[PDB]
Every structure is written in structure tokens, then in C-alpha cells.
From a paper:
We recently reported a flavin‐trafficking protein (Ftp) in the syphilis spirochete Treponema pallidum (Ftp_Tp) as the first bacterial metal‐dependent FAD pyrophosphatase that hydrolyzes FAD into AMP and FMN in the periplasm. Orthologs of Ftp_Tp in other bacteria (formerly ApbE) appear to lack this hydrolytic activity; rather, they flavinylate the redox subunit, NqrC, via their metal‐dependent FMN transferase activity. In the current study, we identified a bimetal center in the crystal structure of Escherichia coli Ftp (Ftp_Ec) and show via mutagenesis that a single amino acid substitution converts it from an FAD‐binding protein to a Mg2+‐dependent FAD pyrophosphatase (Ftp_Tp‐like). A high‐resolution structure of the Ftp‐mediated flavinylated protein of Shewanella oneidensis NqrC identified an essential lysine in phosphoester‐threonyl‐FMN bond formation in the posttranslationally modified flavoproteins.
We were also unsuccessful in our attempt to obtain an FAD‐bound structure of the Ftp_EcE169K protein variant (this residue is analogous to the active‐site residue K165 in Ftp_Tp), but once again obtained a structure that was determined at a higher resolution than wild‐type (1.75 vs. 1.88 Å) with a similarly improved final Rfree parameter. There are four monomers in the asymmetric unit of each crystal structure, and the r.m.s.d. of the monomers within each structure ranges from 0.5 to 1.6 Å and 0.3 to 1.6 Å, respectively, between the two structures for approximately 300 Cα carbons. John Wiley & Sons, LtdIn the site previously denoted in the Ftp_Tp structure as metal binding site 1, a single metal ion is bound in the wild‐type and Ftp_EcE169K protein variant structures. Aided by the high resolution of our structural data, two water molecules were observed bound to each metal ion and thus the coordination number for the metal is seven, consistent with a Ca2+ rather than a Mg2+ ion as observed in the Ftp_Tp structures. Refinement of the metal in this site as a Mg2+ ion resulted in large positive peaks in a difference electron‐density map; these peaks disappeared when modeled as a Ca2+ ion. Thus, in agreement with the original structure determination, we have assigned these as Ca2+ ions. Superposition of three representative Ftp_Ec monomers illustrates the inherent flexibility of the loop region near the active site comprising residues 237–253.
Numbering used by the authors:
A (entry chain C): 13 to 115, 120 to 216, 223 to 329
B (entry chain A): 12 to 119, 122 to 213, 223 to 244, 247 to 328
The structure:
């Protein structure tokens, strides 16, 4: 059967929904629902909009529980846990440190300034409180600053998938930026096509899962022998220096994948592989070694490959 | 055409099954061991019939302060409380004392007076339980010492989802796993077709999804007696004619949570929730000697 592709803009990037063919009125109605939901998610999570739910929390100096939506609570919960499991490499409180660099560095902070700033960051400073009819965030530092840009697209893709289910669409491939979520087979009873970066192509079936990628071998800045990156390691408060070009993660949700791919990118190849082993993650890595790109997959990732 | 290996065993007072194509005897044996070990651990985490389960340690405590639990415990309870809210209290993981008052637990009295029921209701309610999450730790907290939490209505869905995680960990991409009536389906069977999932036979294809069924069987094969399903709000047996609910959801845990709540609510109130939440649901009602069925549009999308 045929396929309808809807596309639009959100979160500084694009969204796409590929679904079984629907009629024109149905397609228009669905696109309106999708854009409305994504607009609301952007308004929930954005740091750019000073009136977002997130930015209202940031602007509050309260150390008491702060009411939030179920989505906010769950995004932060997942972020804190994957933060913990990547030894702090995935850190949604690192904003103040990032703000020191203007992210080649053009304005560089001293070691003293870095140290002063990391005192206003830390995953330990956040708590999520869930109850039946309400939920909260709580910070123990008034000027803690939370930034969800590294996990927002993954959530948005998951939420987009749930919207499809609610609309009686149980076969789909949806995406927000590089974060994808898919369930069910395509019109020909085969996996929805999800292609992986081939640096020199591998295809995966992410049915029942989400996938997300951090980095690209086509946006890998490198001067002399040094990596040039605007990605700040939250434990050093400095840009990463390793040769991990891109990391792709398949996880049970795109939110999780989006959190993992960020943490693993920060950790770099050796430490990322230890986390991948420990957690049994499905991961694909591209590294730059001399004049060649090298690829690597965990056993769990290989199981998702299609032929 | 490739051979499907079927592994089965006991867990949580019921049985589990895993169907996996193209797997050899050595791998099957290793996989059965891992499955049983994991399910044993999930039973040890959740069971109210195991005196030293993680859950029973919490239940036995009189503490009103945060109580450390596993990530899985935190998420199961969070999911349960929210779906409890969205079913207007019908799905209630704190209803145990009322069920025990009637003696309607599976492993066990006089008919209680309404006065006694109402007094017992003071020891129950979704509002009494909180889940707290932090980077390296998470907690349950009750504001009533004798609150009693029972997760039997969602434990099978969780366990089935957790089995899917194990399949992935083990590099198994095609499978049908089930714990009692909770299942997850992924990929093609040995014949290269979607796993056959039958509802009592109408057939659904739930590839990439989970499913669960809940029912009321005291009169299913007759009515001559009461339902043993207690309405958490009245503290009395349900009086409506809904005898089975099947839910298809992205996860078996969600499915298992909804099917219990919808079952308690009954046909009219369940349909309201199903519409508002856009759920994929199949309902069986028994009027007198005649069964009637109803499917939401979202459920119909899964029919073959
Ligand atoms: Ca990310
Ligand atoms: Ca249930
Ligand atoms: Na700090
Ligand atoms: Na009560």
C-alpha cells in the first residue's frame, strides 16, 4: 500500500511522519495535530523561550517542589539516570559551564572560572517527585540551570509516536531532527528504512524502539592534531579532545537514545565502550584514526541490522 | 521456513512462554536459564506472596519517610499511579486491604458491613503514595503507615517488557514473549509471518507492541454469584456486565495497567476513558446468556 509523508519545522530542526496512505482531509487534520503538539513540546522544553515551563523553573529561586507536567518529570528522570550511568558525561545542569565558552574557542575561561562555574552545576542537585495526579521538580541550589536540548528531540519523537497510536496509526516512522521512533512494518510488510552513516550502507529495523545520533563524519572539525569541538565535557568543563566522530544509539525509546548518544559522545571511544558493555547498549561508533574512519558496533546493535 | 523453539516455565503464580525462531539447543538452554533467573528476580522484587520481597519489606515498614527502591519499582509505581488517576481511581494498587476484607484474594470470610468497608477504605487510596527519583537513587514514600501496595495487576506486563529487554541484551530480534496474558510481539515467526495473537478466534498483529487481558470469571461460564473484582471506590464487588478487557499498547506494562482499570470501570465509563486517551481496546460483556463485543477504532487497526 502507499505511504503519506508529513513534514514540518520544530525545535530548530525538521520533523517527519511517514504513515500508511491517508486521504487529504485526514492528512491536513493530522498535520495540524502534529504541529500543535510539537509547538507545545517546544514551548514546554525550550531555553530560548523565556516563558517556557523549563525557563520558568530556571528563573525561580525556590528550593521547594515545583509543579511540572508528566513529560517534564519523565524527561528529567531519564536524564538523571543516564547521567549517572555515563559518570556524569550526560549532564542537563552543565549550561553555566557551556556559557563560559560561547558554545575553535574565541573566548576561553581560566581554570578558576571553570571551577567556580562547576560549583553551580551537578546532577545531584535535582529531584523528581511523582504522584498520582501531579508531579514536581525540586532543586537544592537556587541558580541551578537546566537545559534539555540534548534530550528534547528524542522525547518529541516518542511523543509524536504516541500521538500516532492515539490516532489509530500503529505503523509508522516518525522523526524529530536525528531522533526517530518506529513501530509496525511499512506498506509492503517490511521494516521502515532507517539508514546508518557509512563513512567510506548499513540499514536497521528499529521496530518498537527509538534511535538517535550525535555527531557526523561530515561535521568533524579538526585542526593540526587536535579535535575542535563545542561539546563541553561537564567533568573537565572543557571541550572534548578525543576522536569519536559520531555515535548512534538504539534504545527502547528515542528519549533514552538521545540521552545516551550525548553522554557517549562526551566520554569518547574507550570510556563509551565500557559503558556500552556494562549497560548492554546497542551502539554504532565512527572514529577518526589517521587518514581513515573506523566503525564499530556492539553485539546488541548488530542484532538490529537488516539484510 | 525455520523452526520456532518454545520455552515455558512458572512465574508469579502463572506461566511464561518465549517463542524464538532459528535458535539451537545450546542457546535455548542458556536462554531458558537466563529467562527463569530474571523472572525469579522480578517475582522477588514484586510479590506480595513472598514475605521478604522488596515490596513486602516496604509494606511491613511503618515508615513515613522515603524508602529506597529499584529503578523498576519506581517506574512501575509511577505508571500505576498515573493510570490510576486517568481511570478515576479504578486502577488502584493500594486496594489490597479491601480485597482481603472480602477474602477475595486467590489464596484465601464473612461478608463485611458497609461501615467496616468504609473504615478499611481509610487504609487505601492513590493519594497516599509518592515516587522520588534522583541521579543514583529512587524511593517510594507513603504518608500512611499501614498502606499496603500490591502490584499483581501490573507485574505481568512489567515482566513481559523486561523479557523483551533481555531478548535484546541477548541479540534476539524476533520473538513472542508472554507472562500470563501479557505479551510482546516482535518480528516474523518461523514462516516469515507476524506472530499469531488470538483473542477469544479474532486475530491481531501486534508486531512492535504489547497486549494484556484482564477479566471477571466468577460468572463467565454461567449470574449466580458476585464478582471477586472489588471496585476501589465503593469497596464492593463490581455490578456491571463487562467480563473481559484486552488492551494493546506500546508496552505490555501500560496494557496491563489499563486493562484492570477499564475492567473495574465497566462498559460506559471505560469507553469514555478509551475515547479520551485514544486506547486500543477490546471489550467483552455478558448481558444474560448472550455475549457482546466492542472494539475501539485503534484496536481495529491491529486486526488481520
Ligand atoms: Ca542527544
Ligand atoms: Ca492488569
Ligand atoms: Na558542582
Ligand atoms: Na481512603
Amino acid at each position: 500500500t502507499e505511504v503519506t509523508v508529513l513534514e514540518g519545522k520544530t525545535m530548530g530542526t525538521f520533523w517527519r511522519a511517514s504513515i500508511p496512505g491517508i486521504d487529504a482531509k485526514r492528512s491536513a487534520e493530522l498535520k495540524e495535530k502534529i504541529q500543535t503538539q510539537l509547538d507545545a513540546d517546544d514551548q514546554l522544553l525550550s531555553t530560548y523561550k523565556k516563558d517556557s515551563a523549563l525557563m520558568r523553573f530556571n528563573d525561580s529561586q525556590s528550593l521547594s517542589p515545583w509543579p511540572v507536567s508528566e513529560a517534564m518529570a519523565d524527561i528529567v528522570t531519564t536524564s538523571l539516570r543516564i547521567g549517572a550511568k555515563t559518570d556524569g558525561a550526560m549532564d542537563i545542569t552543565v549550561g553555566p559551564l557551556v556559557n563560559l565558552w560561547g558554545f575553535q574557542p574565541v573566548q576561553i575561561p581560566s581554570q578558576e572560572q571553570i571551577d567556580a562555574m562547576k560549583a553551580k552545576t551537578g546532577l545531584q542537585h535535582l529531584t523528581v517527585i511523582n504522584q498520582s495526579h501531579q508531579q514536581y521538580l525540586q532543586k537544592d541550589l537556587p541558580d541551578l540551570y537546566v537545559d534539555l536540548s540534548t534530550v528534547g528531540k528524542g522525547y518529541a519523537a516518542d511523543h509524536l509516536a504516541r500521538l500516532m497510536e492515539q490516532e489509530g496509526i500503529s505503523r509508522y516512522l516518525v522523526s524529530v531532527g536525528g531522533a526517530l521512533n518506529s513501530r509496525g512494518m511499512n506498506g509492503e510488510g517490511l521494516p521502515w528504512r532507517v539508514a546508518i552513516q557509512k563513512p567510506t550502507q548499513a540499514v536497521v529495523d528499529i521496530n518498537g524502539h527509538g534511535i538517535s545520533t550525535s555527531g557526523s563524519y561530515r561535521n568533524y572539525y579538526e585542526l593540526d592534531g587536535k579535535r575542535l569541538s563545542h561539546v563541553i565535557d561537564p567533568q573537565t568543563g572543557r571541550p572534548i579532545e578525543h576522536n569519536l566522530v559520531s555515535v548512534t544509539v538504539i534504545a527502547p525509546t528515542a528519549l533514552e537514545a538521545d540521552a545516551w548518544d550525548t553522554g557517549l559522545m562526551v566520554l569518547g571511544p574507550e570510556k563509551a565502550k565500557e559503558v556500552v558493555r556494562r549497560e548492554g547498549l546497542a551502539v554504532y561508533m565512527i572514529t577518526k584514526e589517521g587518514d581513515s574512519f573506523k566503525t564499530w558496533m556492539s553485539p546488541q546493535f548488530k542484532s538490529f541490522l537488516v539484510s
